[PDB]
Design an enzyme around this catalytic site. Structure first.
Site, PDB file in Angstrom:
ATOM      1  N   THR A  26     -19.764 -64.847 -54.542  1.00 35.61           N
ATOM      2  CA  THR A  26     -18.578 -64.010 -54.385  1.00 35.61           C
ATOM      3  C   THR A  26     -18.926 -62.631 -53.839  1.00 35.61           C
ATOM      4  O   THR A  26     -18.226 -62.116 -52.960  1.00 35.61           O
ATOM      5  CB  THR A  26     -17.848 -63.890 -55.720  1.00 35.61           C
ATOM      6  OG1 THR A  26     -18.750 -63.382 -56.708  1.00 35.61           O
ATOM      7  CG2 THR A  26     -17.317 -65.244 -56.158  1.00 35.61           C
ATOM      8  N   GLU A  27     -20.007 -62.021 -54.324  1.00 33.05           N
ATOM      9  CA  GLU A  27     -20.296 -60.649 -53.941  1.00 33.05           C
ATOM     10  C   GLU A  27     -20.980 -60.573 -52.584  1.00 33.05           C
ATOM     11  O   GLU A  27     -21.010 -59.508 -51.960  1.00 33.05           O
ATOM     12  CB  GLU A  27     -21.154 -59.967 -55.006  1.00 33.05           C
ATOM     13  CG  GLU A  27     -20.491 -59.869 -56.369  1.00 33.05           C
ATOM     14  CD  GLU A  27     -19.571 -58.667 -56.492  1.00 33.05           C
ATOM     15  OE1 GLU A  27     -19.919 -57.724 -57.232  1.00 33.05           O
ATOM     16  OE2 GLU A  27     -18.497 -58.667 -55.853  1.00 33.05           O
ATOM     17  N   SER A  28     -21.537 -61.683 -52.103  1.00 34.91           N
ATOM     18  CA  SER A  28     -22.296 -61.635 -50.864  1.00 34.91           C
ATOM     19  C   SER A  28     -21.971 -62.728 -49.863  1.00 34.91           C
ATOM     20  O   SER A  28     -22.198 -62.510 -48.670  1.00 34.91           O
ATOM     21  CB  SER A  28     -23.800 -61.692 -51.163  1.00 34.91           C
ATOM     22  OG  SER A  28     -24.192 -63.007 -51.528  1.00 34.91           O
TER      23      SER A  28
END
Lengths: 1101, 150, 124, 73, 50, 82
Positions: A26-28
């Site tokens: 999700t973050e990357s």
């Protein structure tokens, strides 16, 4: 990139594994470097959290721009593990706290969450929190939310279940408890050894029960008192009389924790016919054994054999009815009722001194036979089996029945003499091996290694006992501090090596009076333990400061001891004066001597005809010198131990040299020259010169090259028991029962692990004809097991230390099965890496984020070293292939991948079942069966109640051992079949894939690690020396080859006792040999048997 | 006995009490087990498998399967959980009943095939409210054709 | 006693239970036993051998050889099983003696000689 | 010695009834004979034959089977 | 404990147990062990004042 | 710390204390080392300090007589009177 790093970062300091993967995604969206609108530039996207987070955990960090590929992943994993810890077992709040910040705007939301999912939470907050509606397992996760349009019951279920998608077999099944998984503090061992009667009960925790060990002692003593008062009476009595005939299942029985033995003698009331109380001779009696515990090891085996056999019978009756619902009858025989009843009758006859009602009778005739002396006869009945001359019938799929032994050796993948010396020595050294095995089995069970949570296990738990028993022998101060139940192994090792020493200094204690001191350096007085330096420890030292580094290190490490002791300073100069130099010895002389004698270990791999006694360099190797890089470098690190590839590989060379010495003189020069100079003199045309080649063979066998023979343990035990039946009519029944239980356990394992595991059921164990393209995969799978045995570091404290120097699917619990699966999946991964790279390409591995221990350059190299040595692929197997400094990187790549991807997810999945490899899927499905069984009703309810992560270990270890046994034989079977004439002669293929041969192949194969001592070292009677008689007799008239022939063939222990000992055997000798060599495949603790039972029956048949 | 051995958890925490209480009364250790077993029977369904053995696959507490607020509802809900456990076994072929376990927690009815792959949660809130709406509009259909007669 | 020894298989657990109860009630162990023996004896039929000894071959529990619903079905089954056991003994008696035994697994009046030669399963 | 062991087994394989062991040796164990060995187990009988019963009677000395007191009469 | 051969083999920085026992020992001279002299010091302080 | 707590020094009324109660333990542990008859009469919970003192000084001695137990092979016997 990639999840291999997450597997290793999420098994530390936490954590739900899939959480890290989801956060990274999700973050990357899986990008190595990063930048963001809000500021954070990294995979986990942290810029504010650079300094504090990196500093706060296991590894620290340096700058902003240098957010590391691993240091950052581990730091974020620790932060998330704290967020999971700092709040509760509610991971969703931890995720929300990370995403929205802890303490800024965010902190109201974290508190707001504590009132229901709510709306106090915002656009990114609630949506991101909902994205992690997988594992696990917060109340708000069920509370966040809140065919297709149908009512009808189905509908309700569909719209409520909501698939979770996460499972850690280690949070929901076996949860690491406090007492288990505690390495013992070096002081607490001293309390456990003094205030616990038997340490086996330190594991069982019904409670409870912290804190602390001052309570576990009070519990493991009171439970040992509660055990020997009643457990014994109840179990023994109940099963003693009528285990089958009674007879029970036992399929629904108490976990059976307490019982060990004890008062279990099965005098079935009935089935006793004539009860002659006394004796037939002074033999008979009872198990004629020479170890204490011989009447309890047997008893244990039996309780464990009887319970398991009756259980296999009941479960085969149950699966019979489970198949009656399809058709009323096919044949269904099916089952072991035969073997188990004929074993119960034999046990009753053994305990009641008569009435062998388990004897088929009688006729005829005793053809065909006959593998070794014993003539058998096939009974038209249950598959197999043989009937003896008594005839005590041997169930098929037994290691004894000579029909099966043939079928397996059939198609499948004055003073005298030298030979008398060889037999005396092989008859006394087997006895001292048995006495050593007893003490090792008694020591590897002290609290340090077993009671507490697992530490080094188990191939290391014998290595770190032999290391102590060798380092106490060589320097005796260190001795003084060794556990007593363990000092009795140092005593026996020292006595054995001292007897070989006392016999080599003057091997004239025999017929001849010449032959002088084969030994290398007499006057160097100490128990010489064989200095045999290792291949891989030398590789690690020649990887950095390669050639002159080690060549100077092993020199100065000896030069240290040369000046650090006042007596070695004398016994080196006493040798140096004699070789070169008048009394005064210059310190340059000793320097050159040490340098040139260390060069022998530096460059040429002499140490891993001539011998290896020669490496007995006079210096003492205990002190370490400092290398220019800082690491202190001794020589005992170059040395080896483990008395497994050392003791029985030294004893054979010593016994060969001693026997050739007792013949006339030295082995190398004398023997060789003379035997050859008969060859090169008489002669090419000579008809009786092949008879001289016959004597050259005597020489090889005696010396101990032995032509890698000792085909099997069992072909010896067959004639052993056949002759034992003559004199000792009680040990005769004992040795049949133990081997019958041995065969029944493995023939049960074949059936169960054939029905349950997918790769085995529909292809490997499948009859015929051929797997179309899996030949290209079977070749690579077998080449993997070849290359591993060719490369692996032949030690124990150099493999796990090298593996953990980079820091069921988790070696902290049930380590027994994890060890087998690691040393199994690694060959698959390795063969896949070789085959892929070979000719043709498939580079899943080259592009890996599992790039640890292998950088771009080493990975690329592991490729050219693989390409240079094989072609579409049993090719080399070359000396230079192993003595290659870059070849250890291949082993390391393979093992690290096998412990990063194939064997350290906490859940089985669909990862590679439409991908590599042939053995990879087999071990993956074995791990799947392990997890599936470990979730059964029987086994889960047994763990929760008693914990005892060692019992399920010893259960799931035997299963996987026999399973890989069957697998590695079945895989080779198809390859050999495809090499049988391709004109289909697969009837041959059929003759070698059936449960009556798989059960045998899973006995005389398949290490079977870690065991003190070896299966072969404990039984063996090398016989002839038939061609030797041929040579003696036929060259009687001929010339002088005769003059050589009367030398070699005929027609605890001090050096004086070895000569006096008889030169064949004792009935007690073979008895203890058989009773010991089977403890590695028929256990003693009778509850792991009934655990294996419920594991099998849950799976199927 | 299935229920006592797999003791579901909340009920285990209560369970400890009743046993110790009843024992101090008249002759015990059978009467005690007697009362404890009859209590656990009055308070948890044992979900039996379709196979003819028939080995139990779970003990899920009769209080937490309750759709809505009355225990007649617990009964109605059992009819949701069984439909759920069945769809799984046929849908993913090879998950023979022997393999499946239903395991509770503090407050959750959770359902797993032994290989960790297939595992459906089932919770008070969603089971309740889904059954509520489903019963609602099915009862609507009932009213519709019931009044269609008049 | 044939009955107390051997044990039907299934019964043991109960049998033991019937015992304790009687021992706690009137505390004579012999009285308890005579209320355990009567029970094992009602419950099982000890098939006996044709030989004049006459040593028992097996105790089969009187429940699982029942034929139709009425208990007289146990009685009828006793006849089928006896005709069979002279079926087994008369079919190729390579050797019979006392070697042949028959019993009940959890639910199967299995008859088997000691050896693997003759195993017969008769199921309710 | 081999025949002594066979006869000692026949004494053991049945019971402390040596007469049946003698009959089993004379008439064979398991051929025609095996019915007779079983037939003996019902009284001396007539299922036993010309050489069988007479030879069995010849060993009405030691010892000590019930049928030894039961052979005559 | 230490023979002349063991001093050379010992590591040249520390062990976690080493500094741990060092700290646990060097503080016994200013934080006592017998837990009643602490509460005696307590009542001695509180009687005096703060 | 384990020896300066035996009865002689503490249980009874104070005698030499306390800078002396370690001095009169080290005096015993030194005078037992140098002449060994006097040894034989020392309290056990106190002999374990004489043992460690003797071993420590003996290791320094064994290492000074031949301080070549290191990189170099020169450097000979710093010790005064071997």
């Amino acid at each position: 990139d990639y999840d291999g790093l997450f597997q290793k970062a999420a098994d530390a300091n936490g954590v739900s594994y899939d959480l890290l993967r989801k956060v990274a995604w999700t973050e990357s969206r899986f990008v190595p470097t990063a930048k963001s609108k809000t500021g954070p530039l990294g995979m986990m996207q942290f810029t504010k959290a650079t300094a504090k987070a990196l500093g706060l955990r296991v590894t620290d960090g340096p700058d902003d721009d240098r957010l590391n590929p691993e240091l950052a992943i581990n730091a974020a994993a620790k932060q998330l593990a704290g967020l999971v810890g700092k709040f509760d077992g509610d991971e969703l709040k931890a995720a929300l706290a990370y995403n929205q910040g802890e303490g800024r705007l965010g902190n109201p939301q974290l508190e707001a969450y504590s009132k229901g999912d709510f709306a106090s939470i915002s656009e990114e907050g609630r949506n991101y929190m909902r994205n992690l509606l997988d594992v696990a397992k917060s109340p708000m996760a069920g509370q966040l939310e809140t065919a297709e349009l149908s009512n009808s019951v189905a509908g309700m279920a569909f719209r409520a279940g909501r698939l979770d998608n996460g499972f850690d077999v280690f949070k929901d099944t076996i949860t690491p408890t406090r007492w288990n998984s505690h390495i013992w503090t070096p002081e607490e061992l001293e309390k456990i050894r003094t205030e616990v009667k038997n340490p086996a009960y330190i594991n069982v925790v019904t409670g409870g029960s912290p804190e602390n060990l001052d309570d576990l002692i009070k519990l493991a003593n009171e439970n040992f008192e509660n055990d020997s008062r009643a457990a014994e009476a109840g179990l023994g009595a109940k099963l003693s009389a009528g285990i089958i005939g009674a007879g029970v299942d036992p399929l629904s029985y108490v976990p059976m924790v307490g019982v060990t033995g004890k008062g279990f003698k099965l005098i079935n009331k009935a089935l006793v016919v004539g009860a002659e109380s006394a004796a037939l001779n002074v033999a008979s009696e009872g198990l004629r054994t020479s170890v204490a515990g011989g009447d309890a090891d047997y008893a244990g085996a039996a309780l464990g054999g009887f319970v398991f056999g009756a259980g296999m019978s009941a479960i085969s009756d149950a699966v019979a009815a489970g198949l009656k619902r399809s058709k009323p009858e096919a044949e269904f025989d099916n089952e072991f009722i035969g073997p188990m009843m004929r074993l119960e009758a034999r046990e009753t006859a053994r305990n009641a001194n008569s009435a062998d009602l388990s004897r088929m009778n009688t006729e005829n005739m005793k053809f065909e036979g006959e593998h070794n002396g014993v003539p058998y006869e096939d009974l038209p009945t249950e598959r197999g089996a043989v009937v003896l001359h008594d005839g005590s019938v041997l169930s098929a799929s037994n290691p004894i029945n000579p029909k099966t032994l043939k079928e397996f050796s059939e198609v499948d993948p004055f003073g005298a003499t030298a030979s008398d010396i060889h037999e005396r020595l092989h008859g006394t050294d087997q006895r001292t091996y048995n006495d050593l095995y007893k003490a090792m089995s008694d020591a590897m069970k002290d609290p340090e290694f077993s009671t507490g949570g697992a530490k080094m296990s188990r191939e290391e738990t014998r290595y770190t006992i032999y290391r102590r028993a060798a380092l106490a022998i060589e320097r005796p101060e260190l001795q003084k501090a060794l556990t007593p139940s363990e000092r009795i192994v140092m005593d026996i090792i020292k006595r054995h090596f001292d007897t070989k020493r006392e016999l080599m200094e003057n091997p004239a204690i025999f017929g001849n009076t010449k032959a002088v001191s084969i030994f290398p350096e007499s006057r160097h007085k100490g128990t010489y333990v064989p200095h045999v330096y290792d291949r891989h420890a030398k590789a690690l030292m020649i990887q950095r400061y390669g050639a002159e580094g080690l060549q100077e290190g092993i020199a100065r490490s000896w030069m240290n001891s040369y000046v650090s002791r006042p007596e070695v300073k004398a016994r080196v100069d006493e040798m140096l004066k004699e070789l070169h130099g008048v009394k005064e010895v210059t310190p340059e002389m000793v320097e050159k001597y040490a340098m040139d004698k260390a060069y022998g270990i530096s460059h040429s791999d002499q140490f891993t005809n001539n011998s290896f006694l020669e490496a007995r360099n006079l210096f003492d190797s205990d002190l370490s010198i400092t290398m220019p890089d800082g690491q202190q470098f001794s020589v005992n690190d170059l040395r080896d131990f483990d008395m497994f590839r050392i003791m029985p590989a030294y004893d054979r060379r010593v016994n060969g040299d001693i026997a050739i010495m007792g013949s006339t003189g030295k082995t190398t020069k004398e023997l060789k020259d003379e035997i050859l100079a008969l060859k090169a003199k008489a002669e090419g045309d000579g008809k009786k010169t092949g008879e001289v080649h016959a004597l050259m063979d005597t020489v090889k066998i005696l010396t101990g090259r032995a032509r890698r023979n000792q085909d099997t343990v069992w072909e010896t035990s067959l004639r052993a028991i056949n002759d034992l039946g003559f004199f000792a009519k009680n040990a005769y029944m004992g040795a049949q029962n133990i081997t019958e239980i041995a065969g029944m356990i493995v023939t049960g394992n074949v059936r169960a692990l054939g029905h349950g595991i997918p790769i085995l059921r529909d292809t490997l164990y499948k009859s015929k004809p051929v797997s179309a393209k899996e030949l290209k995969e079977l070749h690579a799978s077998l080449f993997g097991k070849e290359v591993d045995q060719l490369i692996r570091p032949k030690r124990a404290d150099i493999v796990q230390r090298l593996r953990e120097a980079t820091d069921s699917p988790w070696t902290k619990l049930l380590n027994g099965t994890t060890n087998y699966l690691l040393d199994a999946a690694r060959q698959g991964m390795l063969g896949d890496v070789i085959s892929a790279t070979l000719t043709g390409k498939t580079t899943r591995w080259e592009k890996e984020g599992f790039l640890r221990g292998a950088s771009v350059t080493p990975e690329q190299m592991a490729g050219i070293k693989s390409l240079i040595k094989e072609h579409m692929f049993t090719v080399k197997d070359k000396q230079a292939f192993s003595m290659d400094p870059r070849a250890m990187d291949l082993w390391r790549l393979a093992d690290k991948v096998a412990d990063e991807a194939m064997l350290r997810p906490h859940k089985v999945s669909l990862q590679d079942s439409h991908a590599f490899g042939a053995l990879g899927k087999m071990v993956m499905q074995f791990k799947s069966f392990t997890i599936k069984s470990l979730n059964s009703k029987f086994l889960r309810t047994f763990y929760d109640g008693y914990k005892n992560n060692r019992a399920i270990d010893a259960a799931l270890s035997i299963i996987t051992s026999m399973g890989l046994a069957g697998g590695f034989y079945a895989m080779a079977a198809h390859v050999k079949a495809y090499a049988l004439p391709k004109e289909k002669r697969k009837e041959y293929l059929e003759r070698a894939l059936d449960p009556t041969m798989i059960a045998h192949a899973a006995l005389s194969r398949s290490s079977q690690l870690g065991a003190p001592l070896a299966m072969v070292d404990l039984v063996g009677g090398v016989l002839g020396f038939e061609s030797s008689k041929m040579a003696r007799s036929t060259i009687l008239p001929k010339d002088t080859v005769k003059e050589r022939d009367p030398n070699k063939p005929y027609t605890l222990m001090n050096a004086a006792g070895v000569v006096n000992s008889p030169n064949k055997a004792t009935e007690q000798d073979f008895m203890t040999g058989l009773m010991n060599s089977t403890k590695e495949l028929v256990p003693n603790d009778p509850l792991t048997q009934q655990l294996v039972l419920k594991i099998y029956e849950a799976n199927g048949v | 006995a299935p229920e006592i051995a797999r003791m579901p958890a909340s009920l285990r925490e209560s369970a400890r009490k009743i046993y110790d209480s009843v024992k101090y009364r008249s002759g015990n250790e059978s009467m005690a087990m007697e009362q404890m077993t009859k209590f656990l029977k009055e308070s948890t369904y044992t979900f039996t498998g379709d196979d003819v053995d028939g080995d139990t696959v779970g003990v899920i507490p009769k209080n937490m399967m309750q759709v809505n607020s009355d225990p007649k509802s617990w009964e109605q809900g059992r009819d949701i959980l069984e439909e759920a456990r069945k769809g799984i076994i046929a849908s993913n072929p090879w998950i023979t009943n022997k393999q499946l376990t239903m395991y509770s927690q503090g407050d959750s009815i959770y359902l797993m095939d032994t290989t960790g792959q297939v595992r459906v949660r089932y919770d008070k809130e969603l089971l309740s409210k889904v059954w509520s709406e489903n019963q609602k509009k099915l009862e609507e259909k009932a009213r519709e054709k019931a009044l269609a007669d008049v």
